[PDB]
Amino acid sequence: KVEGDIWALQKDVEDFLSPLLGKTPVTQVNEVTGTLRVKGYFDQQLKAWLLEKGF
Amino acid sequence: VAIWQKNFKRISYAKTKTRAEVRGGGRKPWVQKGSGRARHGSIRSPIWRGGGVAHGPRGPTSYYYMLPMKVRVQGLKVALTVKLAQDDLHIVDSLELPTADPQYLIELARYRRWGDSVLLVDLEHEDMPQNVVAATSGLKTFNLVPAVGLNVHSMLKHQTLVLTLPTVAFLEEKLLWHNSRYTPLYPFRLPYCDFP
Amino acid sequence: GPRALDLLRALPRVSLANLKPNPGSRKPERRPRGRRRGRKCGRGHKGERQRGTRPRLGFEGGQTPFYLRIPKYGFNEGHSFRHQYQPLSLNRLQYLIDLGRVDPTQPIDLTQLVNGRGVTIQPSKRDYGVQLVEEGADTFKAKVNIEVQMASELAIAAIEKNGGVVTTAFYDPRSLEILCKPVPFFLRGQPIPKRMLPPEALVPYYTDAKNRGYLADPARFPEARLELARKYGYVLPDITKDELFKMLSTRKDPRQIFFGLAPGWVVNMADKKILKPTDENLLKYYSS
Amino acid sequence: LRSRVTDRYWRVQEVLKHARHFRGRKNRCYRLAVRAVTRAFVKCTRARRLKKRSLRTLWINRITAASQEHGLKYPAFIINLIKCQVELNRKVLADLAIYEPKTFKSLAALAKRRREEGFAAALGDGKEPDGIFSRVVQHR
Amino acid sequence: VTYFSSRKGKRKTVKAVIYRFLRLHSGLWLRRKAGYKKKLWKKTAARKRRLREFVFCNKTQSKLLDKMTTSFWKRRNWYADDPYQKYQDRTNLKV
Amino acid sequence: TARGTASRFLTSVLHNGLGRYVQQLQRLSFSLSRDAPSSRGAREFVEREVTDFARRNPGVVIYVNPRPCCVPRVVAEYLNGAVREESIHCKSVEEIAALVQKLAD
Amino acid sequence: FHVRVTLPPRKVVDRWNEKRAMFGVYDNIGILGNFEKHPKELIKGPIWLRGWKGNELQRCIRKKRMVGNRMFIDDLHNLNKRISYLYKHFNRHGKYR
Amino acid sequence: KFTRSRIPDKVFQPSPEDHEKYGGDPQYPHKLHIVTRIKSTKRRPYWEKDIIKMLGLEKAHTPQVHKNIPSVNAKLKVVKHLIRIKPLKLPQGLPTEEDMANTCLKSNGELVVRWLLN
RNA sequence: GAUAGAAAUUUUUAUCCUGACGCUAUAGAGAUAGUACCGUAAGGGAAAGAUGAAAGAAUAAAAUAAAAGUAAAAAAAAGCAAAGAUUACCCCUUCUACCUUUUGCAUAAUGGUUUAACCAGAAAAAAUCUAACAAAGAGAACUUUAGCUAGAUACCCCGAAACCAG
RNA sequence: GCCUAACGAGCCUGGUGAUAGCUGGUUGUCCGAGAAAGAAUUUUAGUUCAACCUUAAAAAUACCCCAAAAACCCUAAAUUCCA
RNA sequence: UCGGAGUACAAAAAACCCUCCGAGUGAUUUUAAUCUAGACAAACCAGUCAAAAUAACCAUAACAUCACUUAUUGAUCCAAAAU
């Protein structure tokens, strides 16, 4: 359920996750579905990070 | 959703007879050995001229399936969205027509550049103004349909959508209802707390 | 919002003529025609398998099959008759209360949990009801009157500390089915049946104040209850002096399915009326 | 829904056009024709690789005729032309032999000279002599 | 196995499985050892122990048993007092 | 196959490229549909490219006919008298451009 | 392989005839209609096939259960045989087991 | 059984005339090999096939360069009948970064740094 | 063992809108017909049609002349019949038919005179792929420690000697 | 032996699309990888497991491998194991 | 069917209507427990070892022994026993 520039979100998500893994996380952007998809289980840390930004 | 609307209704009555249902040939047409030719059982075998069909269509067949609710809803939303974004949606008030002459309607669609075909949606079936019904009963391309008869296929078949104002107020509510709703406990036709 | 919409002004009408299924949605089927998929057509060569006759599933080719050399042992033995209690953690209960699905204000029994879709019962699978488990014990801050079919010491302890009341009640399979989906039952056109008693194995469970059993002697309740405090080291509140107390004390008859209705009545939902038997025999049967 | 092949006609023509010039029933009957056409294509590609060998052998035979005329065998001619740093493929050499008999007699003269120079140097048994045509030039 | 029944057209279960095996919800199957009640006087106490075990089946057997068994048997079960409820989830499995 | 088909020696028409070079392609005729999807590429080509092509080759006359057809064709025609038919049916703008070039040269 | 020498009469299908223009009209009857009738109700067909689907065995088996006692002798017999055949084939034959 | 094969070290003790013969310096071993695969791996045991693959020698009559360290010499020793080994020579020395584009390898086994000036 | 297999208990809203992503003369009924013909009998069981508004327009008028088979037009050293070619048809050079079956077939192992028309892969448990909604999902019944729902992906043809009933 | 031109047990119809681990057959084009047998089995004309292999997917080490190391009478080509 | 030696020379494995010996148990008292890390072996089924911890016993007391010791054995179901 991502409404907007999803590429922005991809940038911010990989910039957020990068300090964790030492490397950029692998990603898939579905622009038509309005969806982002990330390799590995980041579920908790990402709910936290999306809470911090007030969505 | 368009594919769904097309198929889910469909029942093919196409039947072919298997070598079992063909008329005769319960008996071996000649002896297994010595006659010098190919060996056969029934003369109704699928190899033979008049014989049964090897696979072929079988029985009345139903193609029936249901796209999940929220998907069909989403389909309707999207059709509306797209009719609008491409400028081909026109919210009309009323539907009162000055006269029952259909030529009036055709030339009206010519003056506003509405395209060849038009879908006129009204709120209920009985409440349709009689001038419209007269005018639109004798036309092929202009089609009058009540709100509950709005659908993806018909919306993609007609170049232009014309929605009555109470019709908009209806659809908006009907479709929006689903984003906020629980999964059904039992069928929605039964008593629910808030729901009709 | 959706910038996609702005690209749609520029492009031709969406019609029935141009419509593409999402790429990957349909993996195209393949038919045994041509050089690749023809000539033995994936069936191999001669033998039993090219002819389609290979033996049944477990069959090992004549050596005593693996699934039959292993000895029988009761594993699933009598499985159909075991009781099944759908677990509900305090974590889920709290999460439901927080979001306003079940309200703690009125009493919470099975029907309330089902209507919030916090829980799902299927009696046909021999679900005998909800059991309460302690997963969210520490985090649990809510004040509730709850009725479940089973509970753990720790769960109860965690509800008491917050000034609520737990009670374990029993429902037989028919009772249970009626309880969980009441409106489908009220269209059935039958009276409201008696609640059956528990079977002999489950009597020592519901007769104890330990479990806060619905058949338990209330004389032991305030005793056993206080015991639970000594163990977990918290001050037991006086439920009597609370404003919501009249709701917290609310029970059911051991013979009653619902709150405020009674065995033998009939709910006419079209007239929004209740119907009760005036007959003596009926009233003796339903009230026994 | 019955579906039959309507266009079978053309399906057949795309085989049969390649078969027109065959002898016998192979040039009509689709069964026989098909097999024959396939054999014809296979034979064709194999021959496409063969043709190059055939032509090169032709060229060598011709160059040998041409050389033998001048009293010079083929191998001598060719390698002693290499030892002069003259690289002309056999195609071109054969064409010279036919259409440029003069230039070819020159080439043959050169080769013969280079050979004699080689024998002279091998028999001489010293590093000092470098035959005029036995000198090896580097690119500039 | 009957893949399509005669009356219902559904797929039948092979009951001979359901008597000797146990399906945890993770997909692991659990079975008794073979010959564990047989000729005990003749065996070592060590061997006897090895026999009294409940053991797990390899992947192949598991898939075979799953095919031989309908959907109903793979459902999530909550039994009261159940010994095996402890074992039905899998933990710390990195694969 | 080579025994199968006809053959010819390598030649030029009218000793082209000896005295001077003469582009041999004479005229080019397109037929397409304003409406039909099959002709889509061919329409785009007519929009953007044809014009420029016509400047790049002054000596070839280019006739464009919109007509109701299902299969857009381009008919190349040469000084030689030779007429070569082609189908631009269901191709890109890019593909058509390359094709028209082959025809030109 | 002889192909027909005369152009067929060109068949003109107008897509604006009544049946084609009104197609798929009430399909959303459930959603827009405050669910009362499911779209199944719209389906015109054989009694055993309305709003239901299945492979040929299931189909036949179902036909027999519903209308099997209204059937003509020959047809009932044929149906039984078809069922027996399909049973044997699906259950005991195939590649995949 | 046909098996792998030991190759006694005595084979690899060079005689003093060999230096004169093949043009190696008695004092200093060369630094690099140019190895070429001269024969085919077909009809040879799988292990030689593997050794050839991991030496980069897959394609025939193509040169490849390798360190003259013992790690490498071991594998080379296994396949020595399938290959030609000649010492790399640097008349103009090793290439700088300006000379990378102009480098070429002559058949006498020598690497020329400046190729085709003007 | 192969396999077989309930029930209690549940659910089901009228009537009109009937037709066809069924066949088109080897198809669809066996069917122009249970006729001809074949059997003592029970029984078996065919094939076949095509002008036009008018033939009360047959010195008759009109659009395919395209299968195999022949004719127009017999053959000319030499060789799986072609291919490379070539000024040139041959002459030269190079190639051990095709399927099937096999460790291995030019095989002197199998099958086919040829042409036309017919004549043979079918299923959704688990999986994967796409999408919806998501701690829940499904238009009731179920399943859920990221799941649930939907869609798409799959498993042939001909043949015995027999056996049983009438 | 004979019982309507085939009687070690008639014929016809139905059961019947009997069943064949046995033979035969199995229809467009082009591309990517690609297989010779350990175990049981009224089994060796077949199956079902391994080992290989194919399609996806997650990973981290994989071959190659110098010393050192693996038996008691004699004993080869050589294995095993590893930086 | 099971085991030992050769075939099969040095890790393992390895066939034959191949070469040779055996087993389908005795005798004895030291009557040889419970539970569990990790392994061997292995298509599956079966087979093998085994630390720590308990309990038994000297009061910190767990390998039954011999006969080449290796082999002296048999799945499910089903029957008898009642623990």
Ligand SMILES: [Mg+2]
């Ligand atoms: Mg029959």
Ligand SMILES: [Mg+2]
């Ligand atoms: Mg019969």
Ligand SMILES: [Mg+2]
């Ligand atoms: Mg014959």
Ligand SMILES: [Mg+2]
């Ligand atoms: Mg038969």
Ligand SMILES: [Mg+2]
């Ligand atoms: Mg027929």
Ligand SMILES: [Mg+2]
């Ligand atoms: Mg194939």
Ligand SMILES: [Mg+2]
């Ligand atoms: Mg074929």
Ligand SMILES: [Mg+2]
């Ligand atoms: Mg075959």
Ligand SMILES: [Mg+2]
């Ligand atoms: Mg075989």
Ligand SMILES: [Mg+2]
């Ligand atoms: Mg449940």
Ligand SMILES: [Mg+2]
């Ligand atoms: Mg080449």
Ligand SMILES: [Mg+2]
């Ligand atoms: Mg059995």
Ligand SMILES: [Mg+2]
């Ligand atoms: Mg007919």
Ligand SMILES: [Mg+2]
């Ligand atoms: Mg007929």
Ligand SMILES: [Mg+2]
């Ligand atoms: Mg002809």
Ligand SMILES: [Mg+2]
């Ligand atoms: Mg010849």
